[PDB]
Design an enzyme around this catalytic site. Sequence first.
Site, PDB file in Angstrom:
ATOM      1  N   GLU A   1      -1.125 -25.224 -25.471  1.00 30.43           N
ATOM      2  CA  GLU A   1      -1.842 -26.280 -24.729  1.00 30.43           C
ATOM      3  C   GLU A   1      -2.813 -25.650 -23.776  1.00 30.43           C
ATOM      4  O   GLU A   1      -3.935 -26.123 -23.675  1.00 30.43           O
ATOM      5  CB  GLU A   1      -0.894 -27.228 -23.985  1.00 30.43           C
ATOM      6  CG  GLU A   1      -1.506 -28.606 -23.764  1.00 30.43           C
ATOM      7  CD  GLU A   1      -0.581 -29.769 -23.441  1.00 30.43           C
ATOM      8  OE1 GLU A   1       0.551 -29.802 -23.974  1.00 30.43           O
ATOM      9  OE2 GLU A   1      -1.003 -30.667 -22.675  1.00 30.43           O
TER      10      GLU A   1
ATOM     11  N   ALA B   1      -0.055   7.875 -14.526  1.00 31.39           N
ATOM     12  CA  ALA B   1      -1.327   8.021 -15.221  1.00 31.39           C
ATOM     13  C   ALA B   1      -2.484   8.552 -14.344  1.00 31.39           C
ATOM     14  O   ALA B   1      -3.589   8.729 -14.860  1.00 31.39           O
ATOM     15  CB  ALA B   1      -1.703   6.715 -15.890  1.00 31.39           C
TER      16      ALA B   1
ATOM     17  N   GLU C   1       5.708   5.985 -13.247  1.00 33.49           N
ATOM     18  CA  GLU C   1       6.282   6.663 -12.083  1.00 33.49           C
ATOM     19  C   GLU C   1       7.385   5.722 -11.518  1.00 33.49           C
ATOM     20  O   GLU C   1       7.272   4.504 -11.675  1.00 33.49           O
ATOM     21  CB  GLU C   1       5.189   7.041 -11.056  1.00 33.49           C
ATOM     22  CG  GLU C   1       4.955   6.053  -9.918  1.00 33.49           C
ATOM     23  CD  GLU C   1       3.599   5.369  -9.842  1.00 33.49           C
ATOM     24  OE1 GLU C   1       3.013   5.056 -10.905  1.00 33.49           O
ATOM     25  OE2 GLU C   1       3.133   5.119  -8.708  1.00 33.49           O
TER      26      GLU C   1
ATOM     27  N   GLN D   1       1.809  -0.535 -10.698  1.00 29.18           N
ATOM     28  CA  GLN D   1       2.084  -0.909  -9.316  1.00 29.18           C
ATOM     29  C   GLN D   1       1.738  -2.358  -8.982  1.00 29.18           C
ATOM     30  O   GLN D   1       2.616  -3.085  -8.520  1.00 29.18           O
ATOM     31  CB  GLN D   1       1.398   0.060  -8.358  1.00 29.18           C
ATOM     32  CG  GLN D   1       1.852  -0.093  -6.924  1.00 29.18           C
ATOM     33  CD  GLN D   1       1.118   0.857  -6.035  1.00 29.18           C
ATOM     34  OE1 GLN D   1       1.138   2.075  -6.228  1.00 29.18           O
ATOM     35  NE2 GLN D   1       0.437   0.314  -5.050  1.00 29.18           N
ATOM     36  N   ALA D   2       0.478  -2.766  -9.221  1.00 25.86           N
ATOM     37  CA  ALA D   2      -0.013  -4.118  -8.970  1.00 25.86           C
ATOM     38  C   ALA D   2       0.835  -5.174  -9.691  1.00 25.86           C
ATOM     39  O   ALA D   2       1.422  -6.031  -9.038  1.00 25.86           O
ATOM     40  CB  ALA D   2      -1.466  -4.232  -9.396  1.00 25.86           C
TER      41      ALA D   2
ATOM     42  N   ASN E   1      -0.365 -10.312  -1.908  1.00 25.89           N
ATOM     43  CA  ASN E   1       0.619 -10.620  -2.946  1.00 25.89           C
ATOM     44  C   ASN E   1       1.308 -11.961  -2.784  1.00 25.89           C
ATOM     45  O   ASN E   1       1.519 -12.651  -3.790  1.00 25.89           O
ATOM     46  CB  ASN E   1       1.623  -9.495  -3.090  1.00 25.89           C
ATOM     47  CG  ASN E   1       0.981  -8.266  -3.690  1.00 25.89           C
ATOM     48  OD1 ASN E   1      -0.217  -8.254  -4.041  1.00 25.89           O
ATOM     49  ND2 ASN E   1       1.744  -7.193  -3.803  1.00 25.89           N
TER      50      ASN E   1
HETATM   51  N1  LIG Z   1      -3.325  -7.243  -4.952  1.00 25.47           N
HETATM   52  C1  LIG Z   1      -2.724  -6.102  -5.301  1.00 25.47           C
HETATM   53  N2  LIG Z   1      -3.468  -5.072  -5.700  1.00 25.47           N
HETATM   54  C2  LIG Z   1      -2.770  -3.925  -5.812  1.00 25.47           C
HETATM   55  C3  LIG Z   1      -1.428  -3.722  -5.574  1.00 25.47           C
HETATM   56  N3  LIG Z   1      -1.088  -2.403  -5.828  1.00 25.47           N
HETATM   57  C4  LIG Z   1      -2.214  -1.849  -6.214  1.00 25.47           C
HETATM   58  N4  LIG Z   1      -3.271  -2.715  -6.241  1.00 25.47           N
HETATM   59  C5  LIG Z   1      -4.653  -2.427  -6.704  1.00 25.47           C
HETATM   60  O1  LIG Z   1      -4.618  -1.972  -8.048  1.00 25.47           O
HETATM   61  C6  LIG Z   1      -5.539  -0.869  -8.213  1.00 25.47           C
HETATM   62  C7  LIG Z   1      -4.774   0.412  -8.431  1.00 25.47           C
HETATM   63  O2  LIG Z   1      -4.022   0.284  -9.651  1.00 25.47           O
HETATM   64  P1  LIG Z   1      -2.423   0.352  -9.726  1.00 25.47           P
HETATM   65  O3  LIG Z   1      -1.728  -0.873 -10.184  1.00 25.47           O
HETATM   66  O4  LIG Z   1      -1.876   0.742  -8.356  1.00 25.47           O
HETATM   67  O5  LIG Z   1      -2.040   1.572 -10.677  1.00 25.47           O
HETATM   68  P2  LIG Z   1      -0.894   1.843 -11.746  1.00 25.47           P
HETATM   69  O6  LIG Z   1      -0.893   0.748 -12.746  1.00 25.47           O
HETATM   70  O7  LIG Z   1       0.462   1.986 -11.057  1.00 25.47           O
HETATM   71  O8  LIG Z   1      -1.301   3.239 -12.400  1.00 25.47           O
HETATM   72  P3  LIG Z   1      -1.267   4.752 -11.898  1.00 25.47           P
HETATM   73  O9  LIG Z   1      -1.771   4.722 -10.454  1.00 25.47           O
HETATM   74  O10 LIG Z   1      -2.123   5.626 -12.763  1.00 25.47           O
HETATM   75  O11 LIG Z   1       0.209   5.136 -11.895  1.00 25.47           O
HETATM   76  C8  LIG Z   1      -6.378  -0.882  -6.947  1.00 25.47           C
HETATM   77  O12 LIG Z   1      -7.410  -1.842  -7.123  1.00 25.47           O
HETATM   78  C9  LIG Z   1      -5.351  -1.328  -5.915  1.00 25.47           C
HETATM   79  O13 LIG Z   1      -5.920  -1.879  -4.741  1.00 25.47           O
HETATM   80  C10 LIG Z   1      -0.624  -4.869  -5.179  1.00 25.47           C
HETATM   81  O14 LIG Z   1       0.595  -4.913  -4.996  1.00 25.47           O
HETATM   82  N5  LIG Z   1      -1.377  -6.019  -5.081  1.00 25.47           N
HETATM   83 MG   LIG Z   2       1.460   3.949  -9.436  1.00 30.20          MG
END
Ligand SMILES: Nc1nc2c(ncn2[C@@H]2O[C@H](COP(=O)(O)OP(=O)(O)OP(=O)(O)O)[C@@H](O)[C@H]2O)c(=O)[nH]1
Ligand SMILES: [Mg+2]
Lengths: 430, 432, 154
Positions: B253, B98, B70, B10-11, B227
């Site tokens: 570099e 996950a 997902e 997601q992140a 973001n």
């Molecule tokens: N800055 C930032 N943090 C995010 C974002 N989405 C989720 N997070 C953070 O990332 C963490 C959650 O992990 P995720 O990236 O959402 O999870 P994932 O990789 O999709 O994995 P699963 O949830 O198991 O499917 C928490 O610290 C959230 O606050 C985003 O778009 N930006």
């Molecule tokens: Mg997710």
Amino acid sequence: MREIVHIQAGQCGNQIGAKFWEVISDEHGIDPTGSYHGDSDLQLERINVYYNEATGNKYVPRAILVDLEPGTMDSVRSGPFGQIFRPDNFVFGQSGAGNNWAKGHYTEGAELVDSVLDVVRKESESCDCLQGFQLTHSLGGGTGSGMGTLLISKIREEYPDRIMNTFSVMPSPKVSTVVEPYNATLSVHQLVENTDETYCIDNEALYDICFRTLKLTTPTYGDLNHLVSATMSGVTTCLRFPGQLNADLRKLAVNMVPFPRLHFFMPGFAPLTSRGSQQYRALTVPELTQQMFDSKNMMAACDPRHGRYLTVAAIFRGRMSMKEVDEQMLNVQNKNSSYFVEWIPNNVKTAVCDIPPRGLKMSATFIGNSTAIQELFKRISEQFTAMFRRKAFLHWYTGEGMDEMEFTEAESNMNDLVSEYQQYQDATAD
Amino acid sequence: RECISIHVGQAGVQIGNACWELYCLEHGIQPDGQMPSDKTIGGGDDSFNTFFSETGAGKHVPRAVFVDLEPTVIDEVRTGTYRQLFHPEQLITGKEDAANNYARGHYTIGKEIIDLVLDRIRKLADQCTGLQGFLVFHSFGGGTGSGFTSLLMERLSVDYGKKSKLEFSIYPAPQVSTAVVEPYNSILTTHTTLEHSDCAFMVDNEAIYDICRRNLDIERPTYTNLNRLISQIVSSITASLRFDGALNVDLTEFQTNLVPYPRIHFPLATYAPVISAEEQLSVAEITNACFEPANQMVKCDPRHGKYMACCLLYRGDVVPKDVNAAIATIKTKRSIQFVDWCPTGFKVGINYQPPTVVPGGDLAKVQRAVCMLSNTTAIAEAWARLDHKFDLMYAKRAFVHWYVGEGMEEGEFSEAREDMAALEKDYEEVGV
Amino acid sequence: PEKVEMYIKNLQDDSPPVRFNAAVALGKIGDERAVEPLIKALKDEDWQVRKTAAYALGKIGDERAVEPLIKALKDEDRYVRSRAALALGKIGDERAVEPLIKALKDEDEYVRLSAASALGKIGGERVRAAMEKLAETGTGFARKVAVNYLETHK
Ligand SMILES: Nc1nc2c(ncn2[C@@H]2O[C@H](COP(=O)(O)OP(=O)(O)OP(=O)(O)O)[C@@H](O)[C@H]2O)c(=O)[nH]1
Ligand SMILES: [Mg+2]
Ligand SMILES: Nc1nc2c(ncn2[C@@H]2O[C@H](COP(=O)(O)OP(=O)(O)O)[C@@H](O)[C@H]2O)c(=O)[nH]1
């Protein structure tokens, strides 16, 4: 013991090496086409040491020019005395060593090394009786350091009864490349085990002479090499002109090296001048002899008064009284008794050559095996320790095939060498 | 000559489309990939082709891959304004996520998708004349961000050896925190990725949340707010790689200049000016602000550590004399302690291309900007925070049964923590 | 027209990012008045101004730029050399064929590539003759470019 085979590696090796040939070719009366156009009989007497006689009465240097950087090939060839060298003797890669010792000793260098050995074998064949080898290189870079010490090791397994002599230029932070202490420590480890006689030319002392004595504000490498070329011209005088004192490489090594590892020489020259410095007031025998042990005239950054001399070779050049020379060399020992090891009788040897160098009416070259050279190795050890302690940039080397133990081995050897120097400096006759 | 961007979870995915939005704007590329003579950047020479391949049409396609276990997050990319920009095979999704479990993203669920992802990267690598390496975006706390990234990093080392792998990691925060077990996932990813990453840029969610509230005045900052800011900083870090600039040109570099010890490869990035669109700052002001802890990507005190490397990347209205003057005051006036064996040298880069802001974004358009990259001992503070949280839960073995039931051994937790202990000791010892 | 006079005086200006922005602008619009001032900016102190003046001169096309760009293939900066080579390729003047062939033996990969591309864009008969001679009496990369040009041209 007649012929000497010369090898010049890397940037520093080829530049200081080329100035050596330009200088001794002028001294021996050879023009850039290899034709003798001199006046003295003495000029061609021991010409067979550094040159091969070909064509009619044409002389060719017994020189092998190596670098992994092809740029160096054109630099030397397009130079002043670039046309004397055999074209088949240039061994140049297209690669480069990017100042990494491991690149020259293991990867890029180890690939070109056998093509070089093919050329060393070629020149060793047209040798009636080979004295030994002479390598000009830098310990700070990658090619001269890594490939150069690979060459030393590879030559020594094939030609072990031949003398291995080097002109190693020491890296300095004043002059230059953060991993220079690694390249210098790794090369010193090879030199302590695989050379018979090494001339420690320190870039720190070279800069300092230009800066403090010659008054050259910010000197170029052309100014540093002016000190190196004049030093090399004087330290190889014995071998190039007919005489008794240190006539050959082995004879010199026998007199200068009491201990296997303690074979690093503090070179010196008197008088000292800048390039094209319109000559004023010629030196006398007492002025020459005094500038002898004068710390300000040493090509290695050490104080002679900070150690004892194990052995010394002194070379005086020009028209001078032999009784003046003998008188001044005796006083310099009696008025500095304590700085000459008591357990080595007749340790200082003097030589007079009637032929003076280019532009000078009289000169004096000094080769000293002083326990005070530990100062140079201590300086490299300190610089090395700070970096290797944290294992900084170690992966640039270890990535290129090398092991961490090789760094520990080189560090151990260099620390041992310094302790050995100190043990003889503290050693009394009792 | 080329770089591939991998956006995991997601992140990573959400940051990727914010990054790519800015890259397109920076190089004068439309959301369809077209770069017409009216929207073309202008001043000839452009090296953006390290990140964008060129189609026979004249369409510029990102050399990017988006992976999630997902479909929810990548579906938004497929229906978004940039639906046209990426090719369908670049965007990869599973069904079951996950569930904030490292062991699901690394073992159980991650093992199902790893092979397809690799072939999709292979399609991109095959379009590269001289692929330098990868830029990996992911979170520490998500099961996919942590688990699948480490699994992919492991596989990319085998399948692409002499290729650089630079990360952009989402360090957790209690504010934007969707899981209790994020400290476990964070320690586990850092342990398994350490030997596979060449450099890692952390983004501490607490720092960006703090920056949004302080500098942008956002009362309760959302993922949208954070973001736009992350992508601003990230663009400034990656600018070296997309532009005809002299400092940090290729991935090598970047490694050479910033990382002297292999394990200690976590540069702290700072960025000034971060202004809300609601007053002009000089070169002196923005350089000075780089050395202020308030403006950092990661929460840490640099006055408590030592530097191994320090790079200043300026963009816009930045004059050489002013930069030299600004650096000179920072050398003489500040208490910037460097390690003994490394020189006190500030590597400076200047790009005269004006700063590009997000239209409708919270950020104001400034004349000049600066992104400082410092390799400091102070980043061990970020590791310590995480390690303590880990230790609290681990001592009672809380939540561990979720990991052991998803193809993981409990010993991998102890093994992981041991590597973190060593990493913390390394930063301590290197800073004497 | 009214703004072309402005950027020509910004090309002279003290501030390096202002000089860079003036050269970017005169390439984006491209007027015959900007030729000689952009020719002066090819000899600028800053590499970022020199390389974008070179890109501008190639876009506009004016023949007066062919000579300063030939000298620009010898610029100390790798980006200036690549942009000057590409500019000469855009202009397509046969006076650039031999200096571009000398750039085939440059230390920088981009410069070598830019020189190869430029030669292919000019592709007259003097280019062809020089390629024929280089395909037989040529080495490494420079030989590959001669051999590739003659195979891309039946
Ligand atoms: N800055 C930032 N943090 C995010 C974002 N989405 C989720 N997070 C953070 O990332 C963490 C959650 O992990 P995720 O990236 O959402 O999870 P994932 O990789 O999709 O994995 P699963 O949830 O198991 O499917 C928490 O610290 C959230 O606050 C985003 O778009 N930006
Ligand atoms: Mg997710
Ligand atoms: N005095 C002197 N030192 C040199 C010269 N060239 C390089 N050096 C020194 O040698 C070191 C660099 O080694 P170098 O020969 O350039 O690299 P290589 O070709 O990879 O061996 C540094 O300490 C330089 O200061 C030279 O011509 N004269």
